Amino acid sequence: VVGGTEAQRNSWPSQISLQYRSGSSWAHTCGGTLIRQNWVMTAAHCVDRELTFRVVVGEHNLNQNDGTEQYVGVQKIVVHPYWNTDDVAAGYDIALLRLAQSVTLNSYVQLGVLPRAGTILANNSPCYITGWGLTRTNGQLAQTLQQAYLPTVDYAICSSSSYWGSTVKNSMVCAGGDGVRSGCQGDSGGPLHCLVNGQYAVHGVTSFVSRLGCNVTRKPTVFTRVSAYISWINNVIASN
């Protein structure tokens, strides 16, 4: 997250860190959202490489154990069957990870609330991105979870020629693009939390940023639109 601030400890208790084994240790690669005690929602592109993954729930400071974390293996990966790693812009950038055990819920570990199927937010709706992704273009990961206010940019604007044009689809949510605040590498897979009827719900899964930079005017961060996938998510959970 570029242009963010440090989140209060576990104010985003459904945020997870998706990590892969790197030698004798672990490396953060993506965010995700805990949606059942044994299921995480992330981006399909986060699992394009065949690696050993783990999920950390209750995380805040990646470099230090604070007593709130639970670490769990990934037992099954279900990528959307229409995902094409060579065509991010086609969409379908979503995957579900079945965890090797069910995590315990507490003040630090909670299920993320999903929107009702089909929900489209009005332009400029209030949302926050969260993650441990880079804090500047070409920079380094955040040690502690960051948040940034990233209001939505509706499809008509986001898919116009001076923004992302045809690359953005109606199955995506765009947010930000002010040139100061944005998602960045390693926020991918994580949530966009948007306030609806007084409750935050996870409307986006971070999918891509501009190759020109993370915080780039009229290149808002692009998210898979969770509300387009409610039936798919429920079908996967019900059949696994």
Ligand X SMILES: *S(=O)(=O)C(C)(C)C(=O)NCc1cn(Cc2ccc(Br)cc2)nn1
Q: Does the footprint of ligand X cover residue 49 (CB under 6 A)?
A: yes
| Closer Cβ to Na ion, 61 or 125, answer by number | 61
Q: Going by C-beta distance under 8 Å and a sequence separation of 6 or more, which residues neighbour residue 155?
A: 120, 168, 170, 172, 174
Does 19 belong to an annotated binding site? no
The residues that are catalytic are: 45, 93, 188
Q: Does the footprint of ligand X cover residue 45 (CB under 6 A)?
A: yes
CA pair distance 151, 128, nearest whole angstrom: 7
Candidate residues 21, 48, 102, 156; the one interacting with ligand X per rule CB under 6 A: 48
Q: Phi and psi dihedrals of 74, rounded to 5? A: -100, 120
Q: Shortest CA distance to 225 belongs to which of 128, 155, 160, 150?
A: 155
| Region of 117-125, 143-151, 166-174, 206-214 interacting with ligand X (CB under 6 A) | 206-214
Q: Shortest CA distance to 43 belongs to which of 193, 217, 223, 212?
A: 223
- Is residue 7 classed as helix, strand or coil in its secondary structure? coil
Candidate residues 15, 206, 224, 227; the one interacting with ligand X per rule CB under 6 A: 206
Instruction: Tell me the per-residue interface mask from 62 to 101 with Na ion, x by CB under 5 A, - otherwise.
Output: ----x-----------------------------------
| Closer Cβ to ligand X, 88 or 195, answer by number | 88
Q: Phi and psi dihedrals of 132, rounded to 5? A: -105, 10
Candidate residues 11, 37, 61, 185; the one interacting with Na ion per rule CB under 5 A: 61
Q: Shortest CA distance to 208 belongs to which of 119, 103, 91, 55?
A: 91
The partner in contact with residue 61, picked from Na ion, ligand X, none with C-beta cut-offs of 5 to 8 angstroms by kind, is: Na ion
The partner in contact with residue 29, picked from Na ion, ligand X, none with C-beta cut-offs of 5 to 8 angstroms by kind, is: ligand X
User: Strand (E) positions, the chain?
Assistant: 5-6, 15-22, 25-36, 39-42, 53-57, 70-79, 95-99, 127-131, 146-149, 152-153, 172-175, 191-196, 199-208, 221-225
| Closer Cβ to ligand X, 51 or 100, answer by number | 51
Does 6 belong to an annotated binding site? no
The least distance separating Na ion from the CB of residue 215, rounded to whole angstroms, comes to 26
Joined together, the tokens standing for residue 169 give: 């689809």
Residues within the interface to ligand X (CB under 6 A): 20, 29-30, 45-46, 48-49, 51, 133, 183, 185-188, 206, 208-209
Binding site: which residues? 59, 61, 64, 69
